[PDB]
Amino acid sequence: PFDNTTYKNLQHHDYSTYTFLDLNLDLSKFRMPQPSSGRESPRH
Amino acid sequence: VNNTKKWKMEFDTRERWENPLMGWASTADPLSNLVLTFSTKEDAIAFAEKNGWSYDVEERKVPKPKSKSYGANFSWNKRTRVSTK
C-alpha cells in the first residue's frame, strides 16, 4: 500500500559508536585494489 | 636585496684596542671607516689602481634562478610533498 504518514528512517535510533567503522570493515571486502605511488610514504 | 646592488671598496682592518680610561675602542687606522661605493667592478679597480692601493676583487655572487611550483607541494609520487601547511 501507499503510506505518507510515518517516518521510515527509524534505523539510526539503534546505531552504536562503532556503526560507521564496522560498516567500513564490512565494505573492505568489496573494494577494488588501491593504486600505489611506488613508495611507502613521501618520506621514503 | 637593495644593499647588494653596488660595489664597495673597503680596507684591511687594523688594531682596535681598549682605551685605558673608558674602555672605548681606540684606533690608529685612518682608513678604518673608509668605505667607497662604485657602480661597476671596473670603476672600483680603476680607482684602486689610480691611488696605488693593492687590491683584491671578489666576484658578484647572484642567487641562481630557482624552480618554484606551488603544486609540487602536493605531488602524487615525489618526495617533494609537504606534510603540513
mmCIF file of N, CA, C and O in Angstrom, chain A residues 35-37 39 42 44, chain B residues 76-81:
data_model
loop_
_atom_site.group_PDB
_atom_site.id
_atom_site.type_symbol
_atom_site.label_atom_id
_atom_site.label_comp_id
_atom_site.label_asym_id
_atom_site.label_seq_id
_atom_site.Cartn_x
_atom_site.Cartn_y
_atom_site.Cartn_z
ATOM 1 N N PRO A 35 45.414 2.042 -5.808
ATOM 2 C CA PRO A 35 46.612 2.383 -6.572
ATOM 3 C C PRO A 35 47.779 2.672 -5.645
ATOM 4 O O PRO A 35 47.617 2.916 -4.449
ATOM 5 N N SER A 36 48.971 2.628 -6.217
ATOM 6 C CA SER A 36 50.194 2.868 -5.472
ATOM 7 C C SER A 36 50.996 3.969 -6.145
ATOM 8 O O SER A 36 51.027 4.066 -7.375
ATOM 9 N N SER A 37 51.636 4.801 -5.333
ATOM 10 C CA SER A 37 52.544 5.818 -5.833
ATOM 11 C C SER A 37 53.954 5.290 -6.048
ATOM 12 O O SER A 37 54.814 6.039 -6.517
ATOM 13 N N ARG A 39 56.087 4.227 -3.698
ATOM 14 C CA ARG A 39 56.886 4.334 -2.492
ATOM 15 C C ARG A 39 55.965 4.179 -1.292
ATOM 16 O O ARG A 39 54.746 4.293 -1.409
ATOM 17 N N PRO A 42 55.852 9.612 1.324
ATOM 18 C CA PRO A 42 56.728 10.659 0.774
ATOM 19 C C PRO A 42 57.999 10.922 1.578
ATOM 20 O O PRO A 42 58.860 11.664 1.092
ATOM 21 N N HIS A 44 59.835 8.254 2.341
ATOM 22 C CA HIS A 44 60.659 7.148 1.869
ATOM 23 C C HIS A 44 61.374 7.532 0.585
ATOM 24 O O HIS A 44 60.768 7.577 -0.479
ATOM 25 N N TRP B 76 51.888 13.428 -6.387
ATOM 26 C CA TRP B 76 51.354 12.082 -6.230
ATOM 27 C C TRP B 76 52.408 11.102 -5.742
ATOM 28 O O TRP B 76 52.130 10.275 -4.870
ATOM 29 N N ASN B 77 53.624 11.195 -6.262
ATOM 30 C CA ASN B 77 54.622 10.168 -6.032
ATOM 31 C C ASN B 77 55.985 10.693 -5.613
ATOM 32 O O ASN B 77 56.842 9.893 -5.228
ATOM 33 N N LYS B 78 56.211 11.997 -5.662
ATOM 34 C CA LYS B 78 57.529 12.527 -5.363
ATOM 35 C C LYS B 78 57.671 12.840 -3.881
ATOM 36 O O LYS B 78 56.693 13.030 -3.156
ATOM 37 N N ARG B 79 58.923 12.898 -3.440
ATOM 38 C CA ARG B 79 59.264 13.222 -2.063
ATOM 39 C C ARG B 79 59.014 14.679 -1.717
ATOM 40 O O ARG B 79 58.994 15.021 -0.532
ATOM 41 N N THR B 80 58.798 15.537 -2.710
ATOM 42 C CA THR B 80 58.624 16.965 -2.504
ATOM 43 C C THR B 80 57.237 17.341 -1.999
ATOM 44 O O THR B 80 56.895 18.526 -2.023
ATOM 45 N N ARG B 81 56.439 16.373 -1.553
ATOM 46 C CA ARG B 81 55.215 16.681 -0.835
ATOM 47 C C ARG B 81 55.523 17.378 0.475
ATOM 48 O O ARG B 81 56.518 17.083 1.139
#
